[PDB]
Amino acid sequence: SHGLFKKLGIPGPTPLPFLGNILSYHKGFCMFDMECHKKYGKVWGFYDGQQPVLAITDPDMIKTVLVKECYSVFTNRRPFGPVGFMKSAISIAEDEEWKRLRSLLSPTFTSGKLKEMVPIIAQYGDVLVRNLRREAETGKPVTLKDVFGAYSMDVITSTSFGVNIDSLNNPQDPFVENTKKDFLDPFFLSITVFPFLIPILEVLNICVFPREVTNFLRKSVKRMKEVDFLQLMIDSQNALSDLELVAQSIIFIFAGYETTSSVLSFIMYELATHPDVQQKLQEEIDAVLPNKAPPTYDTVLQMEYLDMVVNETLRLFPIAMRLERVCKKDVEINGMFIPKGVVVMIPSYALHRDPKYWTEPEKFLPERFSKKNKDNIDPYIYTPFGSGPRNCIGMRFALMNMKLALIRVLQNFSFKPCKETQIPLKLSLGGLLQPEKPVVLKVESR
Amino acid sequence: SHGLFKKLGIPGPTPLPFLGNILSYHKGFCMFDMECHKKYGKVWGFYDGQQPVLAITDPDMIKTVLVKECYSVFTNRRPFGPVGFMKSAISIAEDEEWKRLRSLLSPTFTSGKLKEMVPIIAQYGDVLVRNLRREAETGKPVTLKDVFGAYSMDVITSTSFGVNIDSLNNPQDPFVENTKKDFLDPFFLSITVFPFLIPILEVLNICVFPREVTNFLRKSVKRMKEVDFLQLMIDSQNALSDLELVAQSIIFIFAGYETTSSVLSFIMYELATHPDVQQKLQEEIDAVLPNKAPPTYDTVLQMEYLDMVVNETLRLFPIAMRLERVCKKDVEINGMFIPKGVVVMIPSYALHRDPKYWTEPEKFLPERFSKKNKDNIDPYIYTPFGSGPRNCIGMRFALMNMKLALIRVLQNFSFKPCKETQIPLKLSLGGLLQPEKPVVLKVESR
Ligand code: HEM
Ligand code: HEM
């Protein structure tokens, strides 16, 4: 199948037998997408093993794939094999089963339901301000990914189940341990080169995740049916099923974990290495919330510079890195024939740093998203939450959760680079958007 | 997945782990379908390995699956794995690709194209009458499956390519050998129990058929593009592709081989063991074609008792044995919920011999199809060529080919049981509708 793009007239790096272009991933997904974009231009193809992948960078064509032809042609993501009951998860379901799940979970993520969760999420921001203060009086630099990781785990366990716990101070609560139970492991690289071996894993009872966890979850869900994501899904039954509920809650946990704390780590890195932005944000936060006033839903949506800082961080670090859709049928979009079975991919990371649309894209400059310049930004080039009907359903929730944590922490602390701070920051090598070395910063009380 | 039918409330034989009910195939597919129909009634489920299979016998429900909901729900047959370029064959293609092939091959099988092939098919009936006459003067019983097999191979090579050859007398013509190059092999049983190992075969270059054949075919197709199935497909290009042409011609050869000669063997067995029917047919043949007159398209459609004999043989021996459709989506038909992925199966063999619709079904009685009693026959119980949009596209061609051979042979010979004739006939054990022992009969010249 390695002759597909050569017969279509699509440029791209010459693939090797069996491997495709996977050896070119040695620089990471991001650098490979940027390099291909430089040498091949607007459209190029490559092979993940035998699987052809067509990258597209034209906004009109991106709009067609993500919006116009979502239901008709580009409905599903890459099927990373049938690997268990997780087929009922909304991010994984396909075609009519996904639409059913999307329709049943959309009212759960309204702004009305989000405002109801604001008082709950606010309590743990105060729990956050106490934990890092203990590690701030220690005089030693703080690893943010552990206080943020503790905060992130606190919020999702209470917003999706109602289990109010201080994780960093309760090492093993029976729920913290089972929730706390490496995406840079060679296994994921072998699955792409051996997609035919996925059926062997599915029958060999090599279930995704241990059956100690998940079984702990379905039992916990049963005892909680007698404001959070679970109650909204329980009341929706009063349709969804019970094992479907466990599947969605699993997605929310992975969603709200290594995205929430990672973006917060990138944000605090940018604020520490740009003190003028940090003070400007603190002056905005103190102006809206005088004397460390508690942040509310409406006061958060009142802070413009906070939104610009969050958006500029997500440009430099789009934690999804790529958007993908599988071509359901032979189609032709915006001037080219897309054959069936090809994976169409939008390289978000490379587009966010493309000088075709961004001035000095390596620089952290929040003013790109000022109300003067947010007009000149194509929504199909800047896609931190995707676009179209299958975009990030938890975008509003994620933005609100991160901002509430930013406000409470910046109302109390300033952040500066320490001896151990990796400057400039390097991105992790092999497939997840995270710092190479964990971010460590000096923290001081205001 | 072995608990599917137990949760649906559908009866059936208790499956074993991993194997399902495949051990119950020791009596053959036919006996297993009859036994299940006796003990479980109108609807029952079983497991081919992990694959659930739901048998249905209600005519209204059969009409819904084959006709009403063909495009919407029950479009495709069981995907016996992706096992090469044969995915472009009409009997194997799925959904929109099958409709395209069906639409491009329908005009090829009209009665107008069939009448045009009558003079060609007629020549080899005369070639047939000479070969078995040589083995008739030998005074020894004749194995029909070899003179019929030679005739069957003659007709399809000339109706799909234009290669006029006497196979039995030309042992190795470069085309006869490559065309002549066991469906009761244990391999097919292992594929059902190990459907996850099919992807390994597809990548390990264990192609279906040797690459000596097929490569001989695509090269032969290229040299023939400068009345038969090929010309009608070549002129249709003037759309279809060239490797698609090789795929369809492969299906026609398998179609016109072990079906044409097998049914003719069953027919001659019934005519030999029922001499009154044989003489009655010979008296009809001589009445329409006086003095061994050559059979034509219109004279063949003029013989009513010939049609009744052919139809009654196809009732006792429906060489397809089963019809199958894959349930594309969660649906409810005629009072029961059919979940996605279940294989819905119509047990044609068991329905053709069901005393609920047939008086003494073991008896060969052509009068069931007299114009008096062909009214009382449900077309969804007697399904020798299937039904609905995905029925046998070559039904008219197959009926005409067999009848022309029957007429010419019966105009010259009578058939009687020999010492070596297996009476009563036993069906082959393991998956193909063919005699256990090959049919041998005494042949005499009129
Ligand atoms: C900074 C935080 C987050 C970012 C940057 C982010 C980004 C994304 C992106 C880029 C996609 C794919 C969109 C596409 O393919 O077009 C996505 C999908 C999704 N996200 Fe997020 N996400 C975040 C947090 C969350 C959270 C907190 C939740 C839920 C609690 C969530 C739930 C989902 C779901 C369910 C999908 C799949 C939706 C579907 O397939 O219909 N995300 N996210
Ligand atoms: C006595 C001779 C034959 C019998 C009893 C027979 C029977 C059948 C049956 C039962 C089916 C499946 C129908 C269904 O699933 O509803 C079928 C399919 C088919 N047959 Fe035949 N067949 C015969 C000869 C032929 C011949 C000679 C050809 C072509 C030269 C042919 C071409 C096909 C094709 C292409 C299909 C699949 C059609 C599709 O999927 O759209 N058959 N046949």
Short mmCIF file of N, CA and C in Angstrom, two decimals, chain A residues 145-244:
data_model
loop_
_atom_site.label_atom_id
_atom_site.label_comp_id
_atom_site.label_asym_id
_atom_site.label_seq_id
_atom_site.Cartn_x
_atom_site.Cartn_y
_atom_site.Cartn_z
N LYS A 145 4.01 20.26 38.59
CA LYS A 145 3.22 19.15 38.08
C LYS A 145 2.71 18.22 39.17
N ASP A 146 3.20 18.36 40.40
CA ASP A 146 2.73 17.55 41.53
C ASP A 146 1.68 18.27 42.36
N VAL A 147 1.82 19.57 42.58
CA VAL A 147 0.75 20.33 43.22
C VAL A 147 -0.39 20.57 42.24
N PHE A 148 -0.07 20.84 40.97
CA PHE A 148 -1.11 20.91 39.95
C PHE A 148 -1.73 19.55 39.71
N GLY A 149 -0.91 18.50 39.65
CA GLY A 149 -1.45 17.16 39.49
C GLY A 149 -2.37 16.76 40.63
N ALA A 150 -2.02 17.16 41.85
CA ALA A 150 -2.90 16.90 42.99
C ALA A 150 -4.19 17.69 42.86
N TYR A 151 -4.10 18.96 42.46
CA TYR A 151 -5.30 19.77 42.27
C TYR A 151 -6.16 19.22 41.15
N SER A 152 -5.54 18.86 40.02
CA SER A 152 -6.30 18.34 38.89
C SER A 152 -7.05 17.07 39.26
N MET A 153 -6.40 16.18 40.01
CA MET A 153 -7.07 14.95 40.45
C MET A 153 -8.18 15.25 41.44
N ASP A 154 -8.04 16.31 42.24
CA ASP A 154 -9.08 16.68 43.19
C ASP A 154 -10.35 17.12 42.48
N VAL A 155 -10.22 17.95 41.44
CA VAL A 155 -11.39 18.57 40.83
C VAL A 155 -12.20 17.55 40.05
N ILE A 156 -11.54 16.66 39.31
CA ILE A 156 -12.29 15.75 38.45
C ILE A 156 -13.00 14.67 39.27
N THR A 157 -12.41 14.25 40.39
CA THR A 157 -13.07 13.26 41.23
C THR A 157 -14.31 13.82 41.92
N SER A 158 -14.38 15.14 42.12
CA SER A 158 -15.55 15.77 42.72
C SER A 158 -16.55 16.28 41.70
N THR A 159 -16.12 16.58 40.47
CA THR A 159 -17.03 17.04 39.44
C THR A 159 -17.64 15.91 38.63
N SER A 160 -17.10 14.70 38.73
CA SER A 160 -17.65 13.55 38.03
C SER A 160 -18.19 12.47 38.95
N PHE A 161 -17.99 12.59 40.27
CA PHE A 161 -18.52 11.62 41.22
C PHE A 161 -19.04 12.24 42.51
N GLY A 162 -18.52 13.37 42.96
CA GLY A 162 -18.88 13.92 44.25
C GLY A 162 -18.01 13.45 45.39
N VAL A 163 -16.78 13.03 45.12
CA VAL A 163 -15.87 12.51 46.13
C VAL A 163 -14.88 13.63 46.46
N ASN A 164 -15.11 14.30 47.59
CA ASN A 164 -14.32 15.46 47.99
C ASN A 164 -13.13 15.00 48.82
N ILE A 165 -11.93 15.08 48.24
CA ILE A 165 -10.72 14.55 48.88
C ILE A 165 -9.55 15.48 48.58
N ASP A 166 -8.67 15.65 49.58
CA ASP A 166 -7.39 16.33 49.41
C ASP A 166 -6.34 15.27 49.09
N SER A 167 -6.01 15.12 47.81
CA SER A 167 -5.19 14.00 47.37
C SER A 167 -3.77 14.09 47.91
N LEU A 168 -3.14 15.27 47.79
CA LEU A 168 -1.75 15.40 48.20
C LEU A 168 -1.56 15.13 49.69
N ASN A 169 -2.59 15.39 50.49
CA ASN A 169 -2.52 15.14 51.93
C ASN A 169 -3.18 13.83 52.34
N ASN A 170 -3.96 13.21 51.46
CA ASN A 170 -4.47 11.87 51.70
C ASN A 170 -3.80 10.92 50.72
N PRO A 171 -2.59 10.42 51.03
CA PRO A 171 -1.83 9.62 50.06
C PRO A 171 -2.62 8.47 49.46
N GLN A 172 -3.13 7.57 50.29
CA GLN A 172 -3.99 6.50 49.80
C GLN A 172 -5.34 6.57 50.52
N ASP A 173 -6.23 7.35 49.97
CA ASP A 173 -7.64 7.04 50.13
C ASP A 173 -8.00 5.94 49.13
N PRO A 174 -8.88 5.00 49.50
CA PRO A 174 -9.22 3.90 48.57
C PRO A 174 -9.62 4.37 47.18
N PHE A 175 -10.04 5.63 47.04
CA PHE A 175 -10.38 6.18 45.74
C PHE A 175 -9.18 6.83 45.05
N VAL A 176 -8.31 7.50 45.82
CA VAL A 176 -7.14 8.15 45.23
C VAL A 176 -6.20 7.12 44.62
N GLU A 177 -5.95 6.02 45.34
CA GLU A 177 -5.06 4.98 44.84
C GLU A 177 -5.58 4.39 43.54
N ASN A 178 -6.85 3.98 43.52
CA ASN A 178 -7.41 3.34 42.34
C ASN A 178 -7.50 4.30 41.16
N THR A 179 -7.66 5.60 41.43
CA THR A 179 -7.61 6.58 40.36
C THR A 179 -6.18 6.80 39.89
N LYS A 180 -5.24 6.91 40.83
CA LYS A 180 -3.84 7.10 40.46
C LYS A 180 -3.27 5.89 39.72
N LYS A 181 -3.92 4.74 39.81
CA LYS A 181 -3.51 3.56 39.06
C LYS A 181 -3.81 3.74 37.57
N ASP A 182 2.88 4.83 31.06
CA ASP A 182 3.76 5.71 30.29
C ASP A 182 3.39 5.69 28.82
N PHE A 183 2.82 6.79 28.33
CA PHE A 183 2.45 6.89 26.93
C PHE A 183 3.65 7.05 26.01
N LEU A 184 4.86 7.12 26.56
CA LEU A 184 6.10 7.07 25.79
C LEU A 184 6.68 5.66 25.75
N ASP A 185 5.88 4.64 26.08
CA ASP A 185 6.32 3.25 26.07
C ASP A 185 6.38 2.74 24.63
N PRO A 186 7.36 1.89 24.31
CA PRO A 186 7.46 1.36 22.94
C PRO A 186 6.23 0.60 22.47
N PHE A 187 5.33 0.21 23.37
CA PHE A 187 4.14 -0.55 22.98
C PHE A 187 3.33 0.20 21.92
N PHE A 188 3.13 1.50 22.12
CA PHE A 188 2.32 2.28 21.19
C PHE A 188 2.96 2.36 19.81
N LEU A 189 4.29 2.32 19.75
CA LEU A 189 4.96 2.32 18.46
C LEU A 189 4.83 0.97 17.77
N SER A 190 4.78 -0.12 18.53
CA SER A 190 4.61 -1.44 17.94
C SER A 190 3.20 -1.65 17.41
N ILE A 191 2.21 -1.03 18.06
CA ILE A 191 0.82 -1.19 17.62
C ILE A 191 0.63 -0.60 16.23
N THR A 192 1.29 0.53 15.95
CA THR A 192 1.18 1.14 14.63
C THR A 192 1.85 0.29 13.57
N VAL A 193 2.99 -0.32 13.90
CA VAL A 193 3.69 -1.16 12.94
C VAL A 193 3.04 -2.53 12.84
N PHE A 194 2.40 -3.00 13.91
CA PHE A 194 1.68 -4.28 13.91
C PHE A 194 0.22 -4.05 14.26
N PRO A 195 -0.55 -3.37 13.39
CA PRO A 195 -1.98 -3.22 13.67
C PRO A 195 -2.74 -4.52 13.59
N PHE A 196 -2.20 -5.53 12.90
CA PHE A 196 -2.82 -6.84 12.81
C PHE A 196 -2.70 -7.64 14.10
N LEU A 197 -1.85 -7.21 15.04
CA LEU A 197 -1.70 -7.90 16.31
C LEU A 197 -2.64 -7.37 17.39
N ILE A 198 -3.35 -6.27 17.11
CA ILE A 198 -4.36 -5.79 18.06
C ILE A 198 -5.46 -6.81 18.29
N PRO A 199 -6.00 -7.50 17.28
CA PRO A 199 -7.00 -8.53 17.57
C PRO A 199 -6.51 -9.63 18.50
N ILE A 200 -5.21 -9.94 18.49
CA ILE A 200 -4.69 -10.95 19.40
C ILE A 200 -4.78 -10.47 20.85
N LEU A 201 -4.47 -9.20 21.09
CA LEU A 201 -4.56 -8.65 22.44
C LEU A 201 -6.00 -8.64 22.94
N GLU A 202 -6.95 -8.36 22.05
CA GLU A 202 -8.34 -8.22 22.48
C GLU A 202 -8.93 -9.54 22.96
N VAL A 203 -8.43 -10.67 22.44
CA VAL A 203 -9.00 -11.96 22.78
C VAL A 203 -8.16 -12.62 23.87
N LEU A 204 -6.89 -12.23 23.97
CA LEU A 204 -5.99 -12.81 24.96
C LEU A 204 -6.23 -12.27 26.36
N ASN A 205 -7.32 -11.52 26.55
CA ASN A 205 -7.69 -10.92 27.83
C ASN A 205 -6.61 -9.97 28.34
N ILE A 206 -5.88 -9.35 27.42
CA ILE A 206 -4.97 -8.26 27.77
C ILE A 206 -5.78 -6.97 27.77
N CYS A 207 -6.77 -6.90 28.66
CA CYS A 207 -7.68 -5.76 28.68
C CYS A 207 -6.92 -4.46 28.88
N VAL A 208 -7.46 -3.38 28.31
CA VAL A 208 -6.96 -2.06 28.65
C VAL A 208 -7.19 -1.83 30.14
N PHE A 209 -6.13 -1.40 30.83
CA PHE A 209 -6.12 -1.16 32.27
C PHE A 209 -6.32 -2.47 33.03
N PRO A 210 -5.82 -2.58 34.25
CA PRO A 210 -6.08 -3.78 35.05
C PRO A 210 -7.56 -3.92 35.36
N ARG A 211 -7.96 -5.16 35.64
CA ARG A 211 -9.32 -5.41 36.11
C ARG A 211 -9.46 -5.22 37.62
N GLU A 212 -8.41 -4.71 38.28
CA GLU A 212 -8.56 -4.21 39.65
C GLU A 212 -9.21 -2.83 39.63
N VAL A 213 -8.63 -1.90 38.87
CA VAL A 213 -9.31 -0.66 38.49
C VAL A 213 -10.40 -1.06 37.51
N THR A 214 -11.26 -0.11 37.13
CA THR A 214 -12.44 -0.35 36.29
C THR A 214 -13.48 -1.19 37.02
N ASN A 215 -13.08 -2.37 37.53
CA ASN A 215 -13.97 -3.11 38.41
C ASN A 215 -14.24 -2.34 39.70
N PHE A 216 -13.21 -1.68 40.23
CA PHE A 216 -13.40 -0.76 41.35
C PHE A 216 -14.33 0.38 40.96
N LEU A 217 -14.35 0.75 39.68
CA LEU A 217 -15.17 1.87 39.22
C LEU A 217 -16.64 1.47 39.08
N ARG A 218 -16.92 0.39 38.35
CA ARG A 218 -18.30 -0.03 38.15
C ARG A 218 -18.99 -0.34 39.47
N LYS A 219 -18.25 -0.87 40.45
CA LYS A 219 -18.82 -1.09 41.77
C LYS A 219 -19.08 0.24 42.47
N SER A 220 -18.16 1.19 42.33
CA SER A 220 -18.35 2.51 42.94
C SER A 220 -19.51 3.25 42.29
N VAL A 221 -19.71 3.08 40.98
CA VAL A 221 -20.84 3.73 40.32
C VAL A 221 -22.16 3.17 40.83
N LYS A 222 -22.20 1.88 41.16
CA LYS A 222 -23.45 1.27 41.62
C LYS A 222 -23.87 1.83 42.97
N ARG A 223 -22.92 2.08 43.86
CA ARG A 223 -23.23 2.59 45.19
C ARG A 223 -23.50 4.09 45.22
N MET A 224 -23.27 4.79 44.11
CA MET A 224 -23.50 6.23 44.04
C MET A 224 -24.79 6.59 43.32
N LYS A 225 -25.62 5.61 42.99
CA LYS A 225 -26.89 5.84 42.32
C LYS A 225 -28.07 5.89 43.28
N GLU A 226 -27.81 5.85 44.59
CA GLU A 226 -28.87 5.91 45.59
C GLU A 226 -28.84 7.23 46.34
N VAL A 227 -24.45 18.02 42.61
CA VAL A 227 -24.09 18.43 41.25
C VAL A 227 -22.73 17.88 40.85
N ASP A 228 -22.72 17.05 39.82
CA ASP A 228 -21.51 16.47 39.25
C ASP A 228 -21.89 15.76 37.96
N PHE A 229 -20.87 15.34 37.20
CA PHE A 229 -21.11 14.68 35.92
C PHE A 229 -21.95 13.41 36.09
N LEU A 230 -21.76 12.68 37.20
CA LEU A 230 -22.46 11.42 37.39
C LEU A 230 -23.95 11.63 37.61
N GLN A 231 -24.31 12.54 38.52
CA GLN A 231 -25.72 12.80 38.78
C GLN A 231 -26.44 13.27 37.52
N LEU A 232 -25.80 14.15 36.75
CA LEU A 232 -26.38 14.60 35.49
C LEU A 232 -26.58 13.44 34.52
N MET A 233 -25.71 12.43 34.58
CA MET A 233 -25.89 11.25 33.75
C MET A 233 -26.87 10.26 34.37
N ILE A 234 -26.94 10.21 35.70
CA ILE A 234 -27.93 9.37 36.36
C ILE A 234 -29.33 9.92 36.12
N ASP A 235 -29.51 11.23 36.29
CA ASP A 235 -30.81 11.84 36.06
C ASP A 235 -31.21 11.76 34.59
N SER A 236 -30.22 11.70 33.68
CA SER A 236 -30.54 11.54 32.27
C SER A 236 -31.16 10.18 31.99
N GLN A 237 -30.71 9.14 32.70
CA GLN A 237 -31.38 7.84 32.61
C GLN A 237 -32.83 7.95 33.04
N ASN A 238 -33.10 8.73 34.08
CA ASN A 238 -34.46 8.96 34.55
C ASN A 238 -35.15 10.00 33.67
N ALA A 239 -31.65 5.98 25.74
CA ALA A 239 -31.01 6.48 26.95
C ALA A 239 -29.63 5.85 27.13
N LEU A 240 -28.93 6.26 28.19
CA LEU A 240 -27.61 5.74 28.51
C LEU A 240 -27.72 4.46 29.33
N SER A 241 -26.63 3.70 29.33
CA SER A 241 -26.54 2.48 30.13
C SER A 241 -25.51 2.67 31.23
N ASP A 242 -25.43 1.67 32.11
CA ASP A 242 -24.58 1.78 33.29
C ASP A 242 -23.10 1.59 32.96
N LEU A 243 -22.78 0.65 32.06
CA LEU A 243 -21.38 0.49 31.68
C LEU A 243 -20.92 1.61 30.76
N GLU A 244 -21.86 2.23 30.03
CA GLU A 244 -21.52 3.44 29.28
C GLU A 244 -21.11 4.57 30.21
#
